[PDB]
Design an enzyme around this catalytic site. Structure first.
Site, PDB file in Angstrom:
ATOM      1  N   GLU A 198     -29.225  23.922  -1.306  1.00  0.00           N
ATOM      2  CA  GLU A 198     -30.099  22.793  -0.939  1.00  0.00           C
ATOM      3  C   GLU A 198     -29.284  21.508  -1.079  1.00  0.00           C
ATOM      4  OE1 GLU A 198     -33.493  22.064  -3.738  1.00  0.00           O
ATOM      5  OE2 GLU A 198     -32.373  23.432  -5.050  1.00  0.00           O
ATOM      6  N   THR A 199     -28.559  21.435  -2.194  1.00  0.00           N
ATOM      7  CA  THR A 199     -27.777  20.281  -2.589  1.00  0.00           C
ATOM      8  C   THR A 199     -26.519  20.804  -3.307  1.00  0.00           C
ATOM      9  OG1 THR A 199     -29.844  19.097  -2.847  1.00  0.00           O
ATOM     10  CG2 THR A 199     -27.910  18.206  -3.936  1.00  0.00           C
ATOM     11  N   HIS A 239      -4.019  14.619  -1.572  1.00  0.00           N
ATOM     12  CA  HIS A 239      -4.384  15.678  -2.539  1.00  0.00           C
ATOM     13  C   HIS A 239      -3.970  17.042  -2.026  1.00  0.00           C
ATOM     14  CE1 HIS A 239      -7.741  13.420  -4.905  1.00  0.00           C
ATOM     15  NE2 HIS A 239      -6.600  12.750  -4.858  1.00  0.00           N
ATOM     16  N   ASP A 242      -1.425   8.805  -1.048  1.00  0.00           N
ATOM     17  CA  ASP A 242      -1.409  10.021  -1.884  1.00  0.00           C
ATOM     18  C   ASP A 242      -2.302  11.046  -1.183  1.00  0.00           C
ATOM     19  OD1 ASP A 242      -2.311  12.096  -3.860  1.00  0.00           O
ATOM     20  OD2 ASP A 242      -2.552  10.573  -5.419  1.00  0.00           O
ATOM     21  N   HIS A 302      -5.711   9.108  -0.350  1.00  0.00           N
ATOM     22  CA  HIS A 302      -6.023   7.722  -0.630  1.00  0.00           C
ATOM     23  C   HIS A 302      -4.799   6.946  -1.025  1.00  0.00           C
ATOM     24  CE1 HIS A 302      -5.744   8.314  -4.999  1.00  0.00           C
ATOM     25  NE2 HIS A 302      -6.339   9.470  -4.768  1.00  0.00           N
ATOM     26  N   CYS A 303      -4.911   5.626  -0.905  1.00  0.00           N
ATOM     27  CA  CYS A 303      -3.871   4.733  -1.384  1.00  0.00           C
ATOM     28  C   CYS A 303      -3.915   4.715  -2.921  1.00  0.00           C
ATOM     29  CB  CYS A 303      -4.114   3.341  -0.815  1.00  0.00           C
ATOM     30  SG  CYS A 303      -2.953   2.066  -1.335  1.00  0.00           S
ATOM     31  N   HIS A 343     -26.972  16.511   0.791  1.00  0.00           N
ATOM     32  CA  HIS A 343     -28.172  17.297   1.096  1.00  0.00           C
ATOM     33  C   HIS A 343     -28.608  16.955   2.504  1.00  0.00           C
ATOM     34  CE1 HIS A 343     -32.090  19.252   0.085  1.00  0.00           C
ATOM     35  NE2 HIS A 343     -32.492  18.482   1.072  1.00  0.00           N
ATOM     36  N   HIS A 364      -7.872  -0.466  -4.655  1.00  0.00           N
ATOM     37  CA  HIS A 364      -7.615  -0.095  -3.284  1.00  0.00           C
ATOM     38  C   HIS A 364      -8.574   1.002  -2.857  1.00  0.00           C
ATOM     39  CE1 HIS A 364      -3.579  -2.073  -2.309  1.00  0.00           C
ATOM     40  NE2 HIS A 364      -3.969  -2.566  -3.472  1.00  0.00           N
ATOM     41  N   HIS A 406     -28.127  13.008  -2.677  1.00  0.00           N
ATOM     42  CA  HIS A 406     -29.493  13.208  -3.171  1.00  0.00           C
ATOM     43  C   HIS A 406     -29.749  12.649  -4.582  1.00  0.00           C
ATOM     44  CE1 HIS A 406     -33.489  14.870  -3.557  1.00  0.00           C
ATOM     45  NE2 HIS A 406     -33.417  15.412  -2.354  1.00  0.00           N
ATOM     46  N   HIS A 422       0.848  -1.194   0.000  1.00  0.00           N
ATOM     47  CA  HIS A 422       0.000   0.000   0.000  1.00  0.00           C
ATOM     48  C   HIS A 422       0.871   1.226   0.000  1.00  0.00           C
ATOM     49  CE1 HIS A 422      -3.507  -2.414   1.164  1.00  0.00           C
ATOM     50  NE2 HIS A 422      -2.723  -3.009   2.046  1.00  0.00           N
ATOM     51  N   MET A 465      -9.933   2.453   0.983  1.00  0.00           N
ATOM     52  CA  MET A 465      -8.630   2.944   1.425  1.00  0.00           C
ATOM     53  C   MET A 465      -8.436   4.395   1.039  1.00  0.00           C
ATOM     54  SD  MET A 465      -5.123   0.723   1.537  1.00  0.00           S
ATOM     55  CE  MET A 465      -3.777   1.306   2.584  1.00  0.00           C
TER      56      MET A 465
HETATM   57 CU   LIG Z   1      -3.797   0.141  -0.417  1.00  0.00          CU
HETATM   58 CU   LIG Z   2     -34.986  16.056  -1.236  1.00  0.00          CU
HETATM   59 CU   LIG Z   3      -6.338  11.099  -6.070  1.00  0.00          CU
END
Ligand SMILES: [Cu+2]
Ligand SMILES: [Cu+2]
Ligand SMILES: [Cu+2]
Ligand SMILES: [Cu+2]
Ligand SMILES: [Cu+2]
Ligand SMILES: [Cu+2]
Lengths: 332, 332, 332
Positions: free
Chosen positions: A272-273, A93, A91, A128-129, A248, A138, A299, A88, A143
């Site tokens: 709302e969303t 971001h 990373d 994430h891996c 939402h 993964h 939603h 594993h 992960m």
């Molecule tokens: Cu992994």
């Molecule tokens: Cu709704």
């Molecule tokens: Cu990424």
């Protein structure tokens, strides 16, 4: 010189909760030390008892929320115990260079590594891996998690005035792709290597079998529902490492939302969303105005109510009849 | 009178490269002349050798990036040689009237036409073919590209200060729907008309079989990886004529992003991932800070790493250990 | 005291049209009274004659657009006649508390109820039915619409100057999931309860069989095309209660767009295409500059042209050859 900076060690908590921190930075830049231990483990992800082999950071899906401030240095000791079977890495971001840290953190079972990166951009970010050749497997095995990099002077609204949260939750949303046979039952596998081609086939359908918050259907309900009080300001950080979602709050709103999660931007008001793109973390700030049960969902309501992407708030306090009331209760 | 304006003829280049231009306009408004020749041609789109009948503007998928400035006039001579078999046209999302030009540019094989439109809105825009009754088939056969309409005074940040790119790339992202049999192998066809109903059936699944950058799995890797140097400011224009994507520079960010591609808006800062809606072009500006290999992907990682939507940057220069370093390299 | 406020009764119209209202509020806050009658009814949704059992507010898909101003009170009398067979309710994304009103409005056939809520946030919002345990089935059977809550001083651009529309339309976009057999034909059902498990199975594919505007393939074409004149300012409110869409005016633009529909935010300028997340309403403002036929589509063009998400404008007036012209008409 980084060695001249304070070091602070953080012990992470299990989602949806978040380790202790200060919104407004109470010190200068620091090296913030985190340790995560990778755990491959069986997880039951629905009411029917479906069981997958989850790949986790620190034992949970999602991995825990790390919190630092802009221009802090994140120093992560990542441990891959020999009780795991796979290689594993991680990373971020939030980081700059070497595939977010992936190219530097490749650990076989029985190995460990320590990565440090400077958190030069404020926001919530996915981590994430991502092992070469097996990335989506993964990530879609659970992960992934997130890190929040707070502005040194905390959060601000669209006018540059302070926004301060009383509570913060982290909702990790996970798409799983449990392989199915011809007839559509979940298929069972004896080892990672034996599972892989069927895992790839399922993923390529682009149709998740399950979409869950905090690792399972119903994980944020009942005794584990999120809570708040009328008048409380709540920040919900939400991440989706692989696939779009549209969060939402049923019965509420996102008063202030960074849908793509980056705090140097003004938030969107009164949502709302909102759309959080796969590979992104977002954050929504809401002040509760009514007590009772709220649902917090993706939603696409099929994804919510059939595939698992729904949790609850239970909110205590005073009902406001000016804001909403039943004038005539249902009757024949 | 348009006839009083300078005329400038542009010879287009193949993506991901972009014809020469100036960001800040060095002349008054012009008529900018482009010629594109439609080519129906066989293309191998993956490592397995899968071959489709692509429908292209100027021989490539995507079609080339056209660049003009706001209030220029775009004059396109579109040529449909008699060696093609289908009728085609072109719709510019940058244009106003007659379905973006589609209603005016319908060319049978052996015909040509010249369209002129005024580029009244600054931004990156999709262009694509759209023949009545066969629109998605042509678009999803690769018959789309983009046009960039620069502000006359170039690009600006969220504060109204200049942003100037050193390099620019155009990443066209293409969803293909290769028809499959019962068992799931790609089905083969003897003519366009014989292919059509199966093409429609595949599209209606809403599940692409391939999602690629610059026309094929791996097209922007190896000798054809994108390049840059530490310190260079790079603009990546990204388009998706038919389906949503969420671009992400692995190990980097979008320092300034117009996710839906329109330059009169302030850019979103510090994006990890952004959503470009189907039918849209977006643009991201990044200053590289670390050398090495980066991947540039659709961050639905299944779409990226299984279906083909991933390319690479190779970046030269000096490694910054303050920004990221391995404190303890992986070891047992 | 709410009883001291003016009451105004609104008689709703059928989409895509919108009941009469004033953009700038000509009175102080009011209680605005709406009545909606739920109708379960058969609907033919495509050219082939496919017929579903639609679940509607006031007889139409979508339900009608309600219009009020910020800080008005919405008072809805919701009637479920005994000729229906199911229990229904209503959730307003515009409202605060009790699941948007759902927990308070549960009506069996032969019952009615009256809900009042204060419209504290300006924007366009989805409303939909949401009965516990059957939410996506009702929503995807057509039981959703929208409400617009206008700022008391009307709409504003990104600079805070007035935007005033001459015409307004409401486009409801509906994803249907008609169950299919092995061979792929639409399956037929004798009662709601008998249909339910197959309805769930179809939904879980996450692949709509139909995506339509105003309730059917081709509903906004021909004699029912939207209309306008060159020079007219048109607001198109667009909602999607369950699934993402990306609206686009073919041959035009969104001059000013609130893609996620909330008017305290500045609009996005000059949009070609914009993303309205499932569970959201958005609004686009455009001034027509050319006469002729425009298509208004979801710009996943397969969803548009194969599954049904396309309508037309017919626009009258003067052609502007400066803006676009055919220099050389198609010829050999
Ligand atoms: Cu992994
Ligand atoms: Cu709704
Ligand atoms: Cu990424
Ligand atoms: Cu064509
Ligand atoms: Cu288009
Ligand atoms: Cu209902």
């Amino acid at each position: 010189d980084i060695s001249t900076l304070p070091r602070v060690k953080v012990d992470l908590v299990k989602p949806p909760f978040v380790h202790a921190h200060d919104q407004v930075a109470k010190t200068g830049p620091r090296v913030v030390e985190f340790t995560m231990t990778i755990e491959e483990k069986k997880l039951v992800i629905d009411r029917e008892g479906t069981e997958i082999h989850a790949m986790t950071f620190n034992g949970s899906v999602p991995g825990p929320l790390m919190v630092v401030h802009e221009n802090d240095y994140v120093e992560l000791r990542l441990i891959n115990p020999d009780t795991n079977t796979l290689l594993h890495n991680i990373d971020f971001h939030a980081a700059t260079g070497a595939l977010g840290g992936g190219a530097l953190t490749q650990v076989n079972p029985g190995e460990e590594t320590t990565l440090r990166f400077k958190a030069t951009k404020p926001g919530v970010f996915v981590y994430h891996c991502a092992p070469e050749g097996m990335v989506p497997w993964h990530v879609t095995s659970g992960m992934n998690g997130a890190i929040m990099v707070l502005p040194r002077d905390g959060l601000k609204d669209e006018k540059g005035q302070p926004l301060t949260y009383d509570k913060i939750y982290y909702v990790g949303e996970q798409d799983f792709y449990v392989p199915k046979d011809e007839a559509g039952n979940y298929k069972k596998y004896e080892t990672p290597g034996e599972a892989y081609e069927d895992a790839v086939k399922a993923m390529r359908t682009l149709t998740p079998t399950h979409i869950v918050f905090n690792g399972a259907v119903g994980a944020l309900t009942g005794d584990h529902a999120l809570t708040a009080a009328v008048g409380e300001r709540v920040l919900v950080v939400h991440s989706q490492a692989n696939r779009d979602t549209r969060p939402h709050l049923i019965g509420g709103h996102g008063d202030y939302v960074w849908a793509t999660g980056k705090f140097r931007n003004p938030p969107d008001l009164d949502q709302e969303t909102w759309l959080i793109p796969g590979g992104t973390a977002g954050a929504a700030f809401y002040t509760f105005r009514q007590p009772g049960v709220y649902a917090y969902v993706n939603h696409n309501l099929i994804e919510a109510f059939e595939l698992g992407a729904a949790g609850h708030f239970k909110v205590t306090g005073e009902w406001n009849d000016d804001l909403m009331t039943s004038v005539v209760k249902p009757a024949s």
